[PDB]
Design an enzyme around this catalytic site. Structure first.
Site, mmCIF file in Angstrom:
data_model
loop_
_atom_site.group_PDB
_atom_site.id
_atom_site.type_symbol
_atom_site.label_atom_id
_atom_site.label_comp_id
_atom_site.label_asym_id
_atom_site.label_seq_id
_atom_site.Cartn_x
_atom_site.Cartn_y
_atom_site.Cartn_z
ATOM 1 N N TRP A 33 -37.187 -8.886 20.417
ATOM 2 C CA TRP A 33 -37.140 -10.135 19.671
ATOM 3 C C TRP A 33 -38.328 -10.148 18.717
ATOM 4 O O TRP A 33 -39.281 -9.387 18.879
ATOM 5 C CB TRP A 33 -37.171 -11.360 20.589
ATOM 6 C CG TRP A 33 -38.288 -11.322 21.571
ATOM 7 C CD1 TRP A 33 -39.607 -11.650 21.343
ATOM 8 C CD2 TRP A 33 -38.205 -10.920 22.937
ATOM 9 N NE1 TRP A 33 -40.335 -11.477 22.492
ATOM 10 C CE2 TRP A 33 -39.500 -11.035 23.486
ATOM 11 C CE3 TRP A 33 -37.157 -10.486 23.760
ATOM 12 C CZ2 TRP A 33 -39.774 -10.726 24.815
ATOM 13 C CZ3 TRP A 33 -37.432 -10.181 25.076
ATOM 14 C CH2 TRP A 33 -38.732 -10.303 25.592
ATOM 15 N N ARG B 22 -45.417 -4.728 24.155
ATOM 16 C CA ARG B 22 -45.179 -3.867 25.296
ATOM 17 C C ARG B 22 -45.414 -4.532 26.640
ATOM 18 O O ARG B 22 -45.201 -3.865 27.657
ATOM 19 C CB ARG B 22 -46.042 -2.614 25.205
ATOM 20 C CG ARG B 22 -45.545 -1.599 24.215
ATOM 21 C CD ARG B 22 -46.497 -0.428 24.191
ATOM 22 N NE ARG B 22 -47.688 -0.725 23.383
ATOM 23 C CZ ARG B 22 -48.799 -0.002 23.398
ATOM 24 N NH1 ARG B 22 -48.887 1.064 24.193
ATOM 25 N NH2 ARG B 22 -49.821 -0.346 22.611
HETATM 26 C C1 HEM Z 1 -39.413 -7.584 22.964
HETATM 27 C C2 HEM Z 1 -40.208 -7.985 21.962
HETATM 28 C C3 HEM Z 1 -40.936 -7.005 20.998
HETATM 29 C C4 HEM Z 1 -41.882 -7.402 20.144
HETATM 30 C C5 HEM Z 1 -42.390 -8.853 20.007
HETATM 31 C C6 HEM Z 1 -42.327 -6.256 19.392
HETATM 32 C C7 HEM Z 1 -43.301 -6.269 18.421
HETATM 33 C C8 HEM Z 1 -43.594 -5.233 17.560
HETATM 34 C C9 HEM Z 1 -44.213 -5.314 16.243
HETATM 35 C C10 HEM Z 1 -44.658 -6.592 15.500
HETATM 36 C C11 HEM Z 1 -44.326 -4.074 15.778
HETATM 37 C C12 HEM Z 1 -44.882 -3.699 14.397
HETATM 38 C C13 HEM Z 1 -43.627 -3.230 13.667
HETATM 39 C C14 HEM Z 1 -43.669 -3.528 12.199
HETATM 40 O O1 HEM Z 1 -44.637 -4.202 11.739
HETATM 41 O O2 HEM Z 1 -42.718 -3.065 11.512
HETATM 42 C C15 HEM Z 1 -43.757 -3.163 16.764
HETATM 43 C C16 HEM Z 1 -43.690 -1.797 16.704
HETATM 44 C C17 HEM Z 1 -42.977 -0.992 17.556
HETATM 45 N N1 HEM Z 1 -42.162 -1.393 18.603
HETATM 46 FE FE1 HEM Z 1 -42.196 -3.174 19.475
HETATM 47 N N2 HEM Z 1 -41.615 -5.143 19.837
HETATM 48 C C18 HEM Z 1 -40.730 -5.575 20.816
HETATM 49 C C19 HEM Z 1 -39.819 -4.763 21.490
HETATM 50 C C20 HEM Z 1 -39.746 -3.393 21.415
HETATM 51 C C21 HEM Z 1 -38.833 -2.551 22.175
HETATM 52 C C22 HEM Z 1 -37.781 -3.146 23.151
HETATM 53 C C23 HEM Z 1 -39.074 -1.273 21.828
HETATM 54 C C24 HEM Z 1 -38.417 0.027 22.337
HETATM 55 C C25 HEM Z 1 -37.617 0.046 23.409
HETATM 56 C C26 HEM Z 1 -40.166 -1.278 20.854
HETATM 57 C C27 HEM Z 1 -40.736 -0.191 20.240
HETATM 58 C C28 HEM Z 1 -41.624 -0.242 19.173
HETATM 59 C C29 HEM Z 1 -42.141 0.899 18.461
HETATM 60 C C30 HEM Z 1 -41.815 2.373 18.783
HETATM 61 C C31 HEM Z 1 -42.956 0.447 17.493
HETATM 62 C C32 HEM Z 1 -43.779 1.264 16.476
HETATM 63 C C33 HEM Z 1 -42.963 2.117 15.525
HETATM 64 C C34 HEM Z 1 -43.932 3.110 14.940
HETATM 65 O O3 HEM Z 1 -44.438 4.013 15.671
HETATM 66 O O4 HEM Z 1 -44.196 2.990 13.725
HETATM 67 N N3 HEM Z 1 -40.521 -2.572 20.629
HETATM 68 N N4 HEM Z 1 -43.356 -3.909 17.836
HETATM 69 C C1 LIG Z 2 -37.419 -3.679 18.565
HETATM 70 C C2 LIG Z 2 -38.154 -4.495 17.526
HETATM 71 C C3 LIG Z 2 -38.876 -5.632 17.879
HETATM 72 C C4 LIG Z 2 -39.546 -6.352 16.891
HETATM 73 N N1 LIG Z 2 -40.233 -7.468 17.204
HETATM 74 N N2 LIG Z 2 -39.481 -5.956 15.603
HETATM 75 C C5 LIG Z 2 -38.783 -4.852 15.235
HETATM 76 C C6 LIG Z 2 -38.750 -4.422 13.785
HETATM 77 C C7 LIG Z 2 -40.114 -3.827 13.418
HETATM 78 C C8 LIG Z 2 -40.097 -2.345 13.757
HETATM 79 C C9 LIG Z 2 -40.357 -1.922 15.042
HETATM 80 F F1 LIG Z 2 -40.631 -2.839 15.984
HETATM 81 C C10 LIG Z 2 -40.334 -0.561 15.369
HETATM 82 C C11 LIG Z 2 -40.062 0.375 14.374
HETATM 83 C C12 LIG Z 2 -39.806 -0.061 13.075
HETATM 84 C C13 LIG Z 2 -39.507 0.936 11.979
HETATM 85 C C14 LIG Z 2 -40.790 1.186 11.187
HETATM 86 C C15 LIG Z 2 -40.685 0.706 9.739
HETATM 87 N N3 LIG Z 2 -41.994 0.871 9.077
HETATM 88 C C16 LIG Z 2 -42.363 2.295 9.056
HETATM 89 C C17 LIG Z 2 -41.945 0.361 7.697
HETATM 90 C C18 LIG Z 2 -39.826 -1.408 12.774
HETATM 91 F F2 LIG Z 2 -39.565 -1.806 11.520
HETATM 92 C C19 LIG Z 2 -38.112 -4.104 16.196
#
Ligand code: HEM
Ligand SMILES: Cc1cc(N)nc(CCc2c(F)ccc(CCCN(C)C)c2F)c1
Ligand code: HEM
Ligand SMILES: Cc1cc(N)nc(CCc2c(F)ccc(CCCN(C)C)c2F)c1
Ligand SMILES: C[C@H](O)[C@H](O)[C@H]1CNc2nc(N)[nH]c(=O)c2N1
Ligand SMILES: C[C@H](O)[C@H](O)[C@H]1CNc2nc(N)[nH]c(=O)c2N1
Ligand SMILES: [Zn+2]
Lengths: 411, 407
Positions: B278, B109
């Site tokens: 990414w 974030r």
């Molecule tokens: C730009 C680089 C970004 C990185 C490095 C990043 C990294 C991560 C990682 C590692 C997770 C854990 C997800 C998992 O283990 O499946 C996550 C969750 C999440 N990311 Fe980010 N993300 C990025 C961009 C974004 C963007 C652009 C959005 C929305 C506009 C976003 C929204 C979310 C949300 C909503 C979750 C959690 C989903 C939940 O509530 O289970 N991310 N992110």
């Molecule tokens: C935008 C973006 C950046 C990044 N670095 N990685 C991802 C994929 C991981 C990821 C998210 F972040 C957010 C939401 C989900 C879905 C949740 C899946 N869960 C519940 C097994 C996710 F699987 C997406």
């Protein structure tokens, strides 16, 4: 009510009813989760309900709930509470309470062993010298020449809070730390404050990097006294690596017996402020945390140097490479020396089995994910994928403030 | 009630006042913490609209201005009349950025304010959705210099006209249950791969087949579309030390683009809002590659490394894990595709947290999700206390569409 937890690797779903017996607070509300917060005097008024609840649990476990022995015991504790304002546990109850405090410790990954706990009744102790003798016997029994055995020694319970028994050490065996005038730290930085207290109390510090601290023991609320554990009782393990012959030249060792001595044991409303307990190490406690935490020994740099890893960019994962090798070295050394240790893979797998068993035989198993998941390789252990419910049951081990902040000095 | 969080590695203490603005619920109570659980009308709407508009006009320093009151009045009149309302472009951008800002599980974030918002609310058909998604994918990919983006399709109306992307991610590999009993490709996507075949897809039945898009406009039946292969950037996975690593045949895609969540802004519900950023290396190297329920390659890598797999205490899994994750980062970096290692990303999040506590009074954060799935305690977030609470605008989970679709 019934609550379900899911393992997202196996899809095993478990139903928790035990949380209904939870009394204490978690720190969370409907609007905020305090799940990753590290840290979230008692009258006759509240004590008999705490006593009665414990005794109901006790007599239920021995299939005697409602018996004459059960009713008489309640009666006996009631009169003793109004007559004397506290009460004394029977030996059987103390043993049960101590085992269940461990069973209830939601942050403990090693609880599959909870029922094999050696309880040493030290409630007849009156002096620090007596405490030292009990602790020596604990250390000797638990160490068992490297074939470690879980043990707890239970000193007299709190009365008016002015006569507390306290072990001022956080652990019975722990290395000193010394802040140098140049700002660097010699030894274990986590133990600098306690080391300084020992020195002030008259300890002659060797000022090395692995000096076993003296015991600082407080009986009956008197000022604490210093004692040196006989070195022959302190089992230590030199750390070498099975492939890297330079690893021994790092000069690392650790002690074999992890023995926590600053927590409070609550049983039936009684507070045991000195209850040192010990088990055996999971390798990552030493290899990951003690050695590689930035505020501990912090050996990642020098290990990575000797391995000749690309240390310029973090994306080489030089830290992750060294971390694994250090943790291989810890496990190798302990096993080679036949000192009990468990790797995080075995320990987490056992905890899952333990946890499933607890849900079936007990209706639940409170577990604190934040603490259960090992500090390296988290998602390749099965606890990572396990949903867990955290709640507080009694008997319980609780944190208490360090005694030097509360102690009224006699002089 | 004015809460403090301590970093135990640095003793930095931060005071959280933002949590008092929290609205939704955590799933926890004073009796039970659910921190590790994966998934815990006109009258409802105007307070939701008012809360969002209040924070919007405060963010642009026009709280209590005529412009503020007029907009509040205007939306109030629109909800009374139409039973919903429409966001100005500026409010939609703000709402989307703040849904990312509030994603307590997102370690990424620090980038929240640099989000490219693609307004797709004029879309009416799945073909139109496809066009918007190809443009998103191309813009976000940017030849490997990835850029964060969200495309927002029309908001829910009566729940019968929902826009939905059935894929969980815009780009993901297919999964096939073999007659042999094992699984080819990604096991996590076996069910969705079936629905693609059940709806007409011609599966190559390979190990890394990019799934087609299954797009649903206005509640109609979803339609299959193949993303132009030239838009799907992929990285062949090699190790900078093990020449045999290439023979494992591993690749991954450059663009993580989550497509199945629900974006809530001012009470309005956007059921189709694919967003992308990414990767952090560990998502691929630790979870995708090494989860037992996924590609589960640890055994084969360890064997090629000739590690002693007889006992767990040799830490052969750990050793292999590190090398796999070295390869993923090395491969993306060598091909100039944006990627961040877990050390850099968690360091950035600590800096982001301090930024949020200073300029905003808090940062909702979910320790269980923020700490990387490898080397937890050597990253600074492990030692960081975090308060988890739900702020809005927000991204939320929603039921998978096949379970809901009135066919
Ligand atoms: C730009 C680089 C970004 C990185 C490095 C990043 C990294 C991560 C990682 C590692 C997770 C854990 C997800 C998992 O283990 O499946 C996550 C969750 C999440 N990311 Fe980010 N993300 C990025 C961009 C974004 C963007 C652009 C959005 C929305 C506009 C976003 C929204 C979310 C949300 C909503 C979750 C959690 C989903 C939940 O509530 O289970 N991310 N992110
Ligand atoms: C935008 C973006 C950046 C990044 N670095 N990685 C991802 C994929 C991981 C990821 C998210 F972040 C957010 C939401 C989900 C879905 C949740 C899946 N869960 C519940 C097994 C996710 F699987 C997406
Ligand atoms: C027998 C082998 C044991 C193993 C492998 C084990 C493992 C662990 C580990 C790794 C932790 C995390 C500690 C940290 O990260 O600092 C822990 C916590 C804990 N252990 Fe165990 N343990 C064992 C025995 C015991 C015994 C005998 C007791 C008490 C009788 C006990 C009570 C606790 C408690 C109360 C905690 C949580 C401390 C807190 O709440 O902060 N453990 N255990
Ligand atoms: C009995 C035993 C077995 C084992 N495997 N390890 C240990 C030491 C770790 C440990 C605990 F378990 C329990 C409590 C503490 C004290 C917590 C210190 N915190 C708050 C920095 C502890 F530091 C003890
Ligand atoms: C801030 C966070 O709660 C703190 O660092 C915790 C995280 N999980 C832990 N888990 C274990 N076993 N031991 C610890 O000391 C910690 N520290
Ligand atoms: C049961 C547990 O909540 C589950 O395995 C979680 C743990 N932490 C996670 N953290 C991240 N970043 N992603 C995940 O999928 C999960 N899974
Ligand atoms: Zn909670």
């Amino acid at each position: 009510r019934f609550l379900k937890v899911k393992n997202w690797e196996t899809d095993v779903v478990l139903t928790d009813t035990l949380h209904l017996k939870s009394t204490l607070e978690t720190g969370c509300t409907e609007h905020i989760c305090m799940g990753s917060i590290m840290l979230p005097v008692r009258t006759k008024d509240q004590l008999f309900p705490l006593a009665k609840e414990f005794l109901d649990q006790y007599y239920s476990s021995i299939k005697r709930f409602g018996s004459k022995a059960h009713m008489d015991r309640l009666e006996e504790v009631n009169k003793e509470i109004e007559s004397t304002s506290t009460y004394q546990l029977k030996d059987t109850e103390l043993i049960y309470g101590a085992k269940h405090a461990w069973r209830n410790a939601s942050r403990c990954v090693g609880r599959i062993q909870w029922s094999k706990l050696q309880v040493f009744d030290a409630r007849d102790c009156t002096t620090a010298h007596g405490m030292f003798n009990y602790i020596c016997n604990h250390v000797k029994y638990a160490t068992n020449k490297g074939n470690l055995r879980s043990a707890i020694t239970i000193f007299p319970q709190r009365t008016d809070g002015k006569h507390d028994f306290r072990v001022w050490n956080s652990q019975l065996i722990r290395y000193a730390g010394y802040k140098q005038p140049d700002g660097s730290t010699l030894g274990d930085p986590a133990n600098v404050q306690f080391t300084e207290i020992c020195i002030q109390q008259g300890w002659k510090a060797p000022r090395g990097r692995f000096d076993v601290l003296p015991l600082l023991l407080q009986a009956n609320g008197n000022d604490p006294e210093l004692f040196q554990i006989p070195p022959e009782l302190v089992l230590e393990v030199p750390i070498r690596h099975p492939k890297f012959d330079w690893f021994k030249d790092l000069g690392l060792k650790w002690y074999g017996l992890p023995a926590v001595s600053n927590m409070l044991l609550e049983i039936g409303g009684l507070e045991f402020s000195a209850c040192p307990f010990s088990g055996w190490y999971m390798g990552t406690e030493i290899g990951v945390r003690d050695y590689c935490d930035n505020s501990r020994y912090n050996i990642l740099e020098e290990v990575a140097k000797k391995m000749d890893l690309d240390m310029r960019k973090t994306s080489s994962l030089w830290k992750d490479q060294a971390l694994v090798e250090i943790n291989i070295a810890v496990l190798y050394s302990f096993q080679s020396d036949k000192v009990t240790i468990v790797d995080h893979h075995s320990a987490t797998e056992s905890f899952i089995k333990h946890m499933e068993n607890e849900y079936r035989c007990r209706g639940g198993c409170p577990a604190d994910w934040v603490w259960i998941v090992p500090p390296m390789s988290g998602s390749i252990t099965p606890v990572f994928h396990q949903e867990m419910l955290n709640y507080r049951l009694t008997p319980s081990f609780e944190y208490q403030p360090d005694p030097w902040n509360t102690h009224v000095w006699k002089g």
